[PDB]
């Protein structure tokens, strides 16, 4: 049970991520794994559930 | 149970990330791993459950 | 049970990262592991349940 | 329970990381550890669980 | 149960973190462990249960 | 029971850590072991249960 009353609110956010990025030779080489070079903005509520990943920007599961 | 009332609020919340990145050359070999080299912003307001993992930048998981 | 009257607000919040990186020759090897080398930013409100990972910038797990 | 009235306030927060990194060579090797060279920003207001790891910015485990 | 009146208030905060870091020649080179070179800023209001860890920069855990 | 009233308040604040750093030649190797270098701010109101770790600025766990 939640109440708002003329109350302005922000709950799971991202606000102004300003990014300038100069890169005159970016060279990549991935076997089998991850590799992340760019701008991720997440923005989330809730992530509800057992063993899950609410967020990932590189990533790598080798389970049994 | 929760009441706001003529209040402002911010509840898991990333306001204002500003970056400049100059990289002439970025060379980067991944062997079954993981590398992250990029801006990462994450709001959450909740994650919920056993064993999860709730933001990751980089993450090798190799379970048993 | 929580009230909030006429009250601001910050909850889990992360505001104004401002990073400037130069870097005129990076150069990542990796094999089987974790190298993390740009920005990160993680607000959260909660990250709730037993053995979970709240957040992680750079991580390696061989659990057994 | 918990009342707030007529007061501004900050629970779990990150306010102006400012940063300047120059780094003309970085040459990064890394079998199967965990290395971090980038800024890391976590704001949580509860992390809760046993065994749980709220913030990690380099971390390597290989429990049993 | 808590009341706070007419109060301004910084529960778990980091503020104004601000540094200039110059690095001509970083090598790093890493087999199994842990190394972390760059900018940590962790603000946390809770942190809770048992064996828990709420802020690792740099960590290594080989438990049994 | 806690009250505040007209009040200003501080529990658990990092407050302007500002460091300025240049380091020409940097060369770590690690071998199992934990290195850390860079800057870590850490502010925490509570941390709680047995065998818990509050802060690790580099660590080594090798129990049983």
Do not use: M, P, R, W
């Not at 003329?6 to 606000?15: A, D, L, N, P, Q």
């Not at 992340?36 to 990533?59: H, L, N, R």
């Amino acid at each position: 049970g939640v109440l708002y009353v003329g109350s302005k609110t922000k709950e799971g956010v991202v606000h102004g991520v300003a990014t300038v990025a100069e890169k005159t030779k970016e060279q990549v080489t991935n076997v089998g794994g991850a590799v992340v070079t760019g701008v991720t903005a997440v923005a989330q509520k809730t992530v509800e559930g057992a063993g899950s990943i609410a967020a990932a920007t590189g990533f790598v599961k080798k389970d049994q």
